[PDB]
Design an enzyme around this catalytic site. Structure first.
Site, PDB file in Angstrom:
ATOM      1  N   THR A  16      -8.722 -16.381 -13.987  1.00 38.40           N
ATOM      2  CA  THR A  16      -9.737 -17.154 -13.784  1.00 38.40           C
ATOM      3  C   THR A  16      -8.690 -17.810 -12.695  1.00 38.40           C
ATOM      4  OG1 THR A  16     -10.330 -18.334 -15.112  1.00 38.40           O
ATOM      5  CG2 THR A  16     -11.703 -16.125 -14.676  1.00 38.40           C
ATOM      6  N   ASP A  39       8.185   6.632  -3.173  1.00 38.70           N
ATOM      7  CA  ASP A  39       9.343   5.825  -2.576  1.00 38.70           C
ATOM      8  C   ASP A  39      10.049   6.252  -2.303  1.00 38.70           C
ATOM      9  OD1 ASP A  39       9.734   2.536  -1.460  1.00 38.70           O
ATOM     10  OD2 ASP A  39       7.979   2.761  -1.861  1.00 38.70           O
ATOM     11  N   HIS A  69      14.221  -0.547  -3.178  1.00 40.29           N
ATOM     12  CA  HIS A  69      12.323  -0.594  -3.136  1.00 40.29           C
ATOM     13  C   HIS A  69      11.438   0.150  -4.166  1.00 40.29           C
ATOM     14  CE1 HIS A  69       8.947  -0.007  -0.782  1.00 40.29           C
ATOM     15  NE2 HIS A  69       8.792  -1.342  -0.744  1.00 40.29           N
ATOM     16  N   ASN A 161       2.206  -4.482   6.159  1.00 38.88           N
ATOM     17  CA  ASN A 161       3.003  -6.180   6.680  1.00 38.88           C
ATOM     18  C   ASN A 161       3.416  -6.444   7.900  1.00 38.88           C
ATOM     19  OD1 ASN A 161       3.652  -5.901   4.110  1.00 38.88           O
ATOM     20  ND2 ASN A 161       5.517  -4.765   4.253  1.00 38.88           N
ATOM     21  N   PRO A 175     -10.858   5.859   4.062  1.00 44.21           N
ATOM     22  CA  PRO A 175     -11.566   4.932   3.965  1.00 44.21           C
ATOM     23  C   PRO A 175     -11.318   5.083   1.864  1.00 44.21           C
ATOM     24  CG  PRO A 175     -12.185   5.994   5.257  1.00 44.21           C
ATOM     25  CD  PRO A 175     -10.903   7.170   5.264  1.00 44.21           C
ATOM     26  N   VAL A 177      -9.295   5.918  -0.244  1.00 40.94           N
ATOM     27  CA  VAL A 177      -8.403   5.499  -1.440  1.00 40.94           C
ATOM     28  C   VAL A 177      -8.100   4.190  -1.206  1.00 40.94           C
ATOM     29  CG1 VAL A 177      -6.282   7.561  -0.560  1.00 40.94           C
ATOM     30  CG2 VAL A 177      -6.739   5.494   0.732  1.00 40.94           C
ATOM     31  N   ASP A 200      -9.684  -3.043  -0.098  1.00 42.83           N
ATOM     32  CA  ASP A 200     -10.683  -3.074  -1.415  1.00 42.83           C
ATOM     33  C   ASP A 200     -10.139  -4.117  -1.835  1.00 42.83           C
ATOM     34  OD1 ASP A 200     -12.036  -0.260  -0.462  1.00 42.83           O
ATOM     35  OD2 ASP A 200      -9.821   0.678  -0.100  1.00 42.83           O
ATOM     36  N   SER A 224       3.723  -4.082  -0.373  1.00 40.85           N
ATOM     37  CA  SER A 224       4.552  -3.533  -1.217  1.00 40.85           C
ATOM     38  C   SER A 224       4.545  -3.742  -2.290  1.00 40.85           C
ATOM     39  CB  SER A 224       6.302  -2.474  -0.404  1.00 40.85           C
ATOM     40  OG  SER A 224       6.295  -2.034   0.357  1.00 40.85           O
ATOM     41  N   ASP A 260     -11.845 -16.192  -4.010  1.00 39.58           N
ATOM     42  CA  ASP A 260     -11.481 -17.490  -4.386  1.00 39.58           C
ATOM     43  C   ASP A 260      -9.769 -17.910  -3.361  1.00 39.58           C
ATOM     44  OD1 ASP A 260     -11.567 -16.149  -8.141  1.00 39.58           O
ATOM     45  OD2 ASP A 260     -12.424 -18.353  -6.515  1.00 39.58           O
TER      46      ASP A 260
END
Length: 279
Positions: A16, A39, A69, A161, A175, A177, A200, A224, A260
């Site tokens: 938290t 990937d 990656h 990015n 939308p 996913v 999300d 990523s 936060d």
């Protein structure tokens, strides 16, 4: 369970508060779930994967990760030291070449591959796909991500990015996913993270230590890196029976740390992935 001196992002997803370094999680650890990492591949021989990773598909001359990656992302999902879901099964689908690039037609084929291939695998606790990739808006790319999700796979995708609205990128803008932005160890939006209403959730994305090719490790940054935190979290929560592939993104948003993060643009969710594990 407690992992001391964990990477900050693992500690963050079980806390938290920022500023701690122990990762706390239920020992089930995603056992019985599966995560596809779509990937540049996965160096499955890395000791950090403990035999739980394997390449299942490539569209290039090799299934090996000649970039790093994909190995890094897979490590954040499920490596023993650097991973969220330390007992999940990892499946690599190499849609990106060793320069990190891939055609949208290949990426689409890889998503439809996972939607079918999960029927060839044993994943009694559920199936997740982690997509740390993207480019400009494409309805066909978004539709492929939507199909994968519809088929019963929790799809987590990088927001991108560009420090820009993710509505203009795919599959980030789909939308249905789970689109993942990036934060840093001080609970600031990562400087490069895309934003917007299509996001999300946020996950740790700045200065993330994980596996690399050549049996090595390194710290790199990006949406990523945030995406596999969320993918691994979903696998972990599915193994616990708390959610399903179709509902995990919403569950993660429901249970996130709220309000936060700093430098969240008006209209973007202020939600940071959190496992809500009480030791």
């Amino acid at each position: 369970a407690a992992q001391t001196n964990a990477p900050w992002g693992l500690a963050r997803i079980s806390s938290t508060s920022p500023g701690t370094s122990t990762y706390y999680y239920d020992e089930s650890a995603g056992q019985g779930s599966c995560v596809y990492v779509i990937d540049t591949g996965i160096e499955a021989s890395h000791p950090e994967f403990e035999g739980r990773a394997q390449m299942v598909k490539t569209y290039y001359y090799s299934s090996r990760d000649g970039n790093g990656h994909g190995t890094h992302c897979a490590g954040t999902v499920g490596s023993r030291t650097y991973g969220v879901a330390k007992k999940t099964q990892l499946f690599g689908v190499k849609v990106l070449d060793d320069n990190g690039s891939g055609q949208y037609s290949t990426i689409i084929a890889g998503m439809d591959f996972v939607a079918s291939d999960k029927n060839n695998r044993n994943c009694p606790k559920g199936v997740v796909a982690s997509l740390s990739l993207g480019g400009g808006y494409s309805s066909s790319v978004n539709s492929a991500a939507a199909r994968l999700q519809s088929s019963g796979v929790m799809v987590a995708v990088a927001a991108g990015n560009n420090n820009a609205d993710a509505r203009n990128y795919s599959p980030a803008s789909e939308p249905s996913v789970c689109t993942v932005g990036a934060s840093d160890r001080y609970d600031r939006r990562s400087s490069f993270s895309n934003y917007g209403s299509v996001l999300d959730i946020f996950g740790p994305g700045t200065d993330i230590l994980s596996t690399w090719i050549g049996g090595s490790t390194r710290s790199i940054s990006g949406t990523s890196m945030a995406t596999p935190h969320v993918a691994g979290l979903a696998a972990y929560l599915m193994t616990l029976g708390k959610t399903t592939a179709a509902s995990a993104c919403r569950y993660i948003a429901d249970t996130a740390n709220k309000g936060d993060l700093s430098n969240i643009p008006f209209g973007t969710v202020n939600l940071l992935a959190y496992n809500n594990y009480q030791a």
